[PDB]
Amino acid sequence: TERIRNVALRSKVCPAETASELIKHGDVVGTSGFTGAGYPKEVPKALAQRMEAAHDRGEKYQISLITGAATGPQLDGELAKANGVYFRSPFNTDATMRNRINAGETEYFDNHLGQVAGRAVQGNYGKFNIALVEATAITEDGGIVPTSSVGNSQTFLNLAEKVIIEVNEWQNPMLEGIHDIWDGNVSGVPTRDIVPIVRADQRVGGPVLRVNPDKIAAIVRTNDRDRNAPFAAPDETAKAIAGYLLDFFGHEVKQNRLPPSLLPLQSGVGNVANAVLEGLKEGPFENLVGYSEVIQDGMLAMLDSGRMRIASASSFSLSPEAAEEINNRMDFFRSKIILRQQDVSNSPGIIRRLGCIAMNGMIEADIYGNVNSTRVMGSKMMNGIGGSGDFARSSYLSIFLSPSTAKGGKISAIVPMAAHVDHIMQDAQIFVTEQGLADLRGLSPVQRAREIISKCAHPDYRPMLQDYFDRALKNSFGKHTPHLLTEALSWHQRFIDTGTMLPS
Template identity: 55%
Template sequence: MATTDRIQNSYLRSKVMSADDAASLIKSGDTVGMSGFTGSGYPKALPQALAGQIEAAHKAGDPFKIGLWTGASTGPELDGALAKADAIKYRLPYNSDPIEREKINRGEMEYFDLHLSHVAPMVWEGFFGNLDVAVIEVTGVKEDGSLIPATSIGNNKTWIDCADKVILEVNDWHDERMEGMHDIYYGTALPPNRVPIPMVHANDRIGQRTLRCDPHKVVGIIKTDLPDKNAPFPPLDDVSKTIAGHLMEFLKWEVQKGRLTNKLLPLQSGVGNVANAVLAGLRDSPFHDLMAYTEVIQDGMMDLIDDGKMLCASSTAFGMSDKAAIRFREKLDFYRDKIILRPQEISNHPEVIRRLGTISMNGMIEADIFGNINSTHVMGSRIMNGIGGSGDFTRNAYLSCFVSPSIAKKGDISTIVPHVSHADHITQDVQVIVTEQGLADLRGLSPKRRAELIIANCSHPDYKPQLEDYYERAKKNALGLHTPMLPSEALSWHQRFLEKKTMRA
């Protein structure tokens, strides 16, 4: 079907223009909220046109920059193009683009990293200032002016509601049969007017199928036919499979103890190779009739749906490989009633996560011997991506699990350290840590018992003696014995790596 047929509102059809003309509506100093969550549902034509215009402005001596808000990370045509053009002054809430990362770490771009569930309410509260323009990719525009979302929802509802002006990209690449997968809830409010979110099961639908949009806020529409671009997943390696195996055995133990059934509880999984290995492990497990309540649907969840292992997956976006995206389009009628896409303020809402009792499984950069987790910073100073939704789920999950190989950089970095160089998740929130070496169930353990278990079960053999030595000396020389710590040595492993390129003593 031609893209023009997807704009059913006659008034909005008159707003169709080129990407260059639409980009010219954005001015230097504007704050722009763009759609996109992972490499899904992000505008592709306008950001590239805007980047070109900003590069030309810079050559003419105009220090043109914008503030950029999104749902999370996006694709290269958005974050990559604008970062390369040095177009971004301020960025929130999550980023994975390598050019942006370098600019942030060089101090050339301001970056605000926050929990994804906090973004929408904080925008409504006005803490970040005015939102000048929303740029939203959609699948189509209905006759009443409402919008059929694309492959992510993210913060689109909030951007459209709060922005002074709206620019749409109607992307013909998205399959129109997606209509009906989306569940847009308009019942949130700020205190003191908040009311409970009416959801008690992961597959409950509580909203409407389309996004509301005042047609008179729309100042331009761009027609595109451009694919989403998600980073491909590497083949599952033995380390990832071993980590997944430890976690499967743990879940079986929880069933044996009567704390779970073979249906488990709604699953949340972070993005990445280990996460997909865990999902792959579920395919051959005794668990069945599974549900997912998460923020990104990856290949592994689609495999579980295909196998009949998973009944429904609720999220705010897809994070599919190219191969899985083709499969999704081929079997879209099959997936339509098994996948629900929601705004991220609902997919990541602490109230709903706590009520459903999710099992959260997220990656980490490092953990210390007491169970603090660093999800965001390398050596304490360099941002990697951001906290994303891991905090939303970790503190509110029924079970909070963190997974990672025990070493990195070919063994020169230990994932288990005396003290994390940056703390995103504190010991009170972290229940289970898993590496390929083993699993540590930290529930109910004092700090000393946690340290002993993490060192014994999760650390790599190359670093275990160093950790044992540090811990034994800390017990003798620390100020107190509740959480034995040597402040002068707590970050010495990171300092050693900075000086010698290895944490080995």
């Protein structure tokens, strides 16, 4: 039917290809989109084609692309294939864009997701020329109904000179009412407002994004799917990880250090975090509440089993098949989900107030429990820090989860020294691998090392880590956090040189 319920605005409809012409070379473009959900699809595809042609003619044509978080093939993919992004922030999962970044062809900075709005308002990315936002519908009074995500859309709408809306009939109209958009000052000029959230299920705003209709330069009708990668069905490794964490949660409850309903849960992006939620869907903890950035398949499964009552997040980040399931049952899930601005879902003040439990994956940790979430070998970007820092530092408990090895055992996820740090020791209390769980609360670095090495390291690597740690204890410059700088990054170099961290 007609998703644009506002009669007057219907006069601004033009084809995706034409709307794309509003976007000029050098422009700073703010888009909707929060990891496989709610990003604009058709105007980028059309812009990507117009860029390729322009380059071939010798015309410069690149934008700065600021988003909520990751997008999808239609946006990051198309624009990277076309070589059309000179600067990208804050988060990406597209293979082609990742290649541009790691080749030095697209400049990239992975800001903390909860801070992006505030930094944009400050002017850190420059002046916003375009806001490109996907919508479920436009209301009679001109409200823009968001889709599978909120992200930074409200901020970009405020900041941008010109606005382009994509109304996507693929998105289930029962999405209207799911979002909560606050009109208060979260990320504007100080002093900011108090955000009155005191419970994860509390709504404090309205269902629509607000914009001056005068700034709307184009409206695009679309019917295209959010495209995310499916999740790995939990294997023996992921199930073991989930088993250790559930045991830990149970022990906390028995010792009265957690409620039996736990505390508001944040679950990070990726396969491992997701696998933990599949364990929780049939766990002994009832009346659970999510206060997360994303609701992945596993979180939807907790709402389905009823083990979780409600989930706050900024987006759905579902597999192609999970996205079908929620669509066919939108009436059920609608009342169990609240989608918020990402500067609210990822507000450290709110996270700490609620006492969230943070669960995040990781590339690697060193023996002292510093965590790399991003840069393989210290230099090659994977996805980005995302909101792992927003949550790890603000949480009641910060938990990191990973297989103890990677690349079929050729890499140890527990190393003498992390090649890049995203999360300092202070920001990580609990580590879980398929080998076991390290509880680091109240421990000095040397004490942390004993736990991590003994509980979490793979048997193939444990003796090597013990060997490093023992010689560091004897020979390190200082003994507070013992290191041998000649060897600290040698396992990484050994991998680069030989394809494996195992010695010859």
